[PDB]
Amino acid sequence: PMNNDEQLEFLINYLLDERSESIDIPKTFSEKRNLLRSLMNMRHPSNISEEFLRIQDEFLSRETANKNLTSVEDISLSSGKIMLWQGDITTLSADAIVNAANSKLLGCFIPMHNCIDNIIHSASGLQLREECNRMIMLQGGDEDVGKAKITNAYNLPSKYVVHTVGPSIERGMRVSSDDVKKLERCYNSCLELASEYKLNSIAFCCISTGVFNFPQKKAAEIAIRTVKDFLNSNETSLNHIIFDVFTDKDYDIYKKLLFG
Template sequence: MTEFDKNKEIDFLINELISTNDRIDNNMEIPDNYDEKRKLLRALMNTQTPVQLSDEFYKIQDRILSEETNNKDLVSCEDIETISQNPNEIDSKIALWQGDITYLKADAIVNAANSQMLGCFIPLHNCIDNQIHSASGFQLRMDCYKIMQEQGHEEANGNAKITSAYNLPSRYVIHTVGPAIPYGREPDENEIRELESCYQSCLELADEHELKSIAFCSISTGVFNFPKDQASKLAIETVRNYLKNNQNTNLEKIIFNTYSDEATEIYRKNLK
């Protein structure tokens, strides 16, 4: 595809999002540079409320996003080494991997969502919710919107929902809502149970759909402020207990995904 065609296609996407968002000036200036246009497209998709978009929009969007995904250095969960190589041990199904979760080829990746379950509306925000929705496509927001409309209320902490992953390399996204801890306060017993429930609910949902692999982000440890070390211990304990109590699980690999060196060291220490 020529540079002209790429610019023409992304202009179409930008213009449709502008025209369907009454909070945006229809005379918004569109950059000339493709990379700047791409940033604007992501920002517009982030801020777009659930709305019917054209088939042509999705056709072009999917072509762009799938090409971007295919150009990434994707990692198969099968290539990630488990903590133990002894098949008789629980940890033979548990792995630790540092990297961008949107690069991971797994049956499911876990998204740390908020109670609205519609993704992050802050343009170009670097939270995992924004990253997953941006790489997946606008269909993900629409699927979540449909689920929430049918449910009729916001998602409770500790629950989980599953959707297709669309243009991500994974098959599914499992969305779960962790507890948000006020700054300067330690988690209380209820919030600890809610975080445990996040992991439990995701594992149960994965088994319901007969999935073989799942990758967990560090739920609630970003802007939701759950202490990283405590959250890591809760996550590991909950996963190990699930595997002990569900020996017929379909799950063959459960991955703890970290992004920073600090988080990786915390998990490495707690997995010993």
């Protein structure tokens, strides 16, 4: 019964066999780990060995348990039902985390790319892309901006992942009212679906910032307002909405707006 390094070798070797190739297995653990992520990032969704899945799960679950995990009650920075936390969303045991997805909803196919979509899929497992693929098959095509779908979170410490597609801003364009309205719809759709599943806590990433080029201050102002308007006007199971920010800049913006 394999150790941690044998599990990692096994997973890498299986994915390389599937491609009919062979690179030289890197030296350092962290090199091989990055090879695994790349291989996972690129795998188009399809039937896969259950032996692989079992080993993937032991491997990724153990990785999850060796991170420093955060529970919702550990977050000290809060205003009523709203919380603000700077940290890695794959280490937060909210009922649901929000994935800022794209319209194909299969995650990120670019190896090592450090968008949240990539990071979430990398830590969750290949099953997340598969579950997403099925919801695409069933609806008969691509996901529109401003909606929300819920999946299992697999080897993350959260129970569910909620996938939403935000608007993108053309380079050098000002944000328009259409753009704002779409981003409000992302937040609301997430909040409504979480309410319908009776979740207690949900964590948002900064939807549409980064790759989709939405300006960070305006995005925050919209995220905060939409969440607040939703809480002020619905009876909801939700008691904790967490704004999970990764950058120092996002932290400073949300902090000033919520507490400053």
